[PDB]
Scaffold this active site. Structure first.
Site, PDB file in Angstrom:
ATOM      1  N   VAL A   1       0.799  -1.227   0.000  1.00 40.65           N
ATOM      2  CA  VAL A   1       0.000   0.000   0.000  1.00 40.65           C
ATOM      3  C   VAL A   1       0.845   1.297   0.000  1.00 40.65           C
ATOM      4  O   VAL A   1       0.414   2.306  -0.553  1.00 40.65           O
ATOM      5  CB  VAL A   1      -1.071   0.028   1.152  1.00 40.65           C
ATOM      6  CG1 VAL A   1      -1.481  -1.396   1.587  1.00 40.65           C
ATOM      7  CG2 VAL A   1      -0.560   0.739   2.319  1.00 40.65           C
ATOM      8  N   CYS A   2       2.031   1.277   0.620  1.00 41.87           N
ATOM      9  CA  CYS A   2       2.949   2.435   0.568  1.00 41.87           C
ATOM     10  C   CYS A   2       3.407   2.731  -0.837  1.00 41.87           C
ATOM     11  O   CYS A   2       3.500   3.889  -1.217  1.00 41.87           O
ATOM     12  CB  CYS A   2       4.220   2.226   1.411  1.00 41.87           C
ATOM     13  SG  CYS A   2       3.878   1.790   3.065  1.00 41.87           S
ATOM     14  N   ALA A   3       3.759   1.678  -1.565  1.00 38.54           N
ATOM     15  CA  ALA A   3       4.147   1.796  -2.984  1.00 38.54           C
ATOM     16  C   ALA A   3       3.028   2.446  -3.861  1.00 38.54           C
ATOM     17  O   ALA A   3       3.296   3.373  -4.634  1.00 38.54           O
ATOM     18  CB  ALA A   3       4.525   0.465  -3.496  1.00 38.54           C
TER      19      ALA A   3
END
Lengths: 165, 165
Positions: B61-63
């Site tokens: 999800v950070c990506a």
């Protein structure tokens, strides 16, 4: 508060502490594993240890480090290979997963950063400050310094062979 | 010493400080750039800022965060997008280089870690301790909190839209 000097190509960079040397008992340490559990040197009692400590996997010569020790790790006797660095685990884990490198164990200073000055490894000045220096240290089953090398130019790899017990 | 609670899926995890909120002036900060130079919020005076702060690029999800804000970054007016995290720069830089993501700017807490508790962002307990929480903060040209969000479950992404000025 001792220092040592290493080099980026040529170039002086201060490294806090001094690296444990032959004779010395290496301080215990806790660092962070791929599944985010904390892992301590004490958990490898009675196995010998290679500590390959490098600025960043994700960086050229450091990556070569890891491949080589992983390949050299099969041809080895009652020994674990701990690839220890500044990187977060997630990067440590993507590197090894992308290269199919299963022998080595990755340890992040995400937690346990004190390990840096405890092992004469913290870079304190320049653009590299906050990273570990390049160095290899080898210990017995009782955390005694069987071998240890602080690399003089960070550019160049360690010497693997040479010295190997 | 305040706290906030966020969650890993469900699950309570303590996060030191409190996130700056609407009205507040956001504290200046210095973090580390791709070329290993130090960069300060003060260098973006008079540009507005989106701070996307996330546990680790290299994490799912950070990506998605980073791709999206990079794509959303072209369709934007007098604003920089700072992708700020726990990762080392080298990983920040390989991610963006592999994804051809040129709009965003990557900032590592390699140095300037105090930014974590200065922005209510340090995770203090659990397997995530040592990482920033997920949060977005938006500021004006004078570092005033135009928007700010601390995500409740880290699993889920922020809300980009919504709220956007």
């Amino acid at each position: 508060t001792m220092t040592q000097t290493v080099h980026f190509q040529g170039n002086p960079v201060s490294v806090a502490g001094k690296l444990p040397q032959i004779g010395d008992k290496a301080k215990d340490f806790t660092l962070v594993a791929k599944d985010l559990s904390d892992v301590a040197l004490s958990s490898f009692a009675g196995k010998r240890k290679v500590l390959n400590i490098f600025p960043s996997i994700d960086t050229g010569v450091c990556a070569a480090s890891v491949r080589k020790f992983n390949q050299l790790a099969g041809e080895l006797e009652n020994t674990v290979v701990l690839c220890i660095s500044s990187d977060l685990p997630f990067a440590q884990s993507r590197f090894c997963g992308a290269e199919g490198l299963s022998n080595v164990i990755t340890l992040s200073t995400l937690r346990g950063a004190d390990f840096k000055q405890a092992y004469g490894v913290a870079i304190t000045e320049g653009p590299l400050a906050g990273l570990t220096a390049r160095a290899v240290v080898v210990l017995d089953g009782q955390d005694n310094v069987i071998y240890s090398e602080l690399v003089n130019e960070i550019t160049t790899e360690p010497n693997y062979d040479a010295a190997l017990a």
